Amino acid sequence: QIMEPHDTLSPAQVDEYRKNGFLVQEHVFDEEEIELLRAEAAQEFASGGERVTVENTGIVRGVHGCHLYSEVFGRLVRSPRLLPIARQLLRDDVYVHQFKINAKRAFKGEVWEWHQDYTFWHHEDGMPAPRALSAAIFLDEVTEFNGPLTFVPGGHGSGMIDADVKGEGWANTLTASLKYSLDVETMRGLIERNGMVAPKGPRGSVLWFDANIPHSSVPNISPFDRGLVLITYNSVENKTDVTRGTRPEWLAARDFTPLTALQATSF
Ligand SMILES: O=C(O)CCC(=O)C(=O)O
Numbered sequence: 540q541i542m543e544p545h546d547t548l549s550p551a552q553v554d555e556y557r558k559n560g561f562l563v564q565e566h567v568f569d570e571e572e573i574e575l576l577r578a579e580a581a582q583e584f585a586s587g588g589e590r591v592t593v594e595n596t597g598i599v600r601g602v603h604g605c606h607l608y609s610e611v612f613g614r615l616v617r618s619p620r621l622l623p624i625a626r627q628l629l630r631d632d633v634y635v636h637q638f639k640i641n642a643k644r645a646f647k648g649e650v651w652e653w654h655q656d657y658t659f660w661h662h663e664d665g666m667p668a669p670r671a672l673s674a675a676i677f678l679d680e681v682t683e684f685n686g687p688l689t690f691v692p693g694g695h696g697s698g699m700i701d702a703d704v705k706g707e708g709w710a711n712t713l714t715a716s717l718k719y720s721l722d723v724e725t726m727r728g729l730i731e732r733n734g735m736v737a738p739k740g741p742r743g744s745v746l747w748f749d750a751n752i753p754h755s756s757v758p759n760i761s762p763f764d765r766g767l768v769l770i771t772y773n774s775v776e777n778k779t780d781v782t783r784g785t786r787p788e789w790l791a792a793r794d795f796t797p798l799t800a801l802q803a804t805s806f
């Protein structure tokens with residue numbers, strides 16, 4: 540049987556990723572593949588227990604660490620459409636630091652405050668450097684009006700930015716109101732210098748973005764959902780210092796075994 544040979548990014552695509560801190564590949568997965576991922580996401584929301592977050596409404600907001608519990612999601616992170624590019628960009632073997640599905644229901648979502656993901660991973664999880672990235676799979680078309688991820692392009696180039704801390708514990712690392720949000724003034728400067736961009740794309744697209752790029756999103760006023768599957772790949776050399784870790788495995792992985800690609804089988 541045959542998997543399609545590993546595809547990697549072009550030099551131009553790599554350059555664009557390093558400069559901007561994000562990159563969209565359209566139509567990586569087809570509709571049937573997206574429907575399978577959507578059905579598995581629904582199962583995870585229903586059966587995820589303590590791994591599930593909820594929104595004012597008690598409506599499901601997020602589920603975490605699904606690659607450890609779902610055979611489908613365990614295979615997805617090894618996909619030949621994903622793993623080769625993560626290896627290319629991080630210039631290493633890689634593993635999954637974090638996995639989450641963020642629902643942003645039609646008419647329903649919440650405001651994710653400005654943040655850098657690395658700030659959490661560094662301070663909560665002991666990630667020593669920002670040699671990590673996230674792949675966001677669009678389960679639905681992402682538009683202007685359904686609460687797209689919004690970035691400051693080039694905003695990753697200064698590194699970790701000083702952030703207000705709010706409360707001990709980790710409960711508020713997954714909430715609308717975030718543990719590390721960005722100085723109102725620091726953001727103004729960044730945006731005045733670099734601007735703001737919300738990448739769009741059809742269902743089945745993949746949005747790659749740097750661990751350190753500032754991002755945000757608003758509620759969904761469209762009649763259409765905005766499901767994102769977010770896979771955070773980390774360089775194996777950049778494995779986190781488990782002695783400085785504070786969160787469970789379904790938020791911050793502790794098995795640093797290098798991922799290998801999915802091969803074709805008869806089942
Ligand atoms: O789903 C969103 O709009 C925000 C996701 C995010 O930035 C995060 O979970 O860190």
Ligand code: PRO
Nearest residue numbers: 655656659660712713
């Ligand atoms: O706590 C975490 O790791 C994720 C990434 C930043 C927001 N929540």
Ligand SMILES: [Fe+3]
Nearest residue numbers: 654655656754
């Ligand atoms: Fe984030």
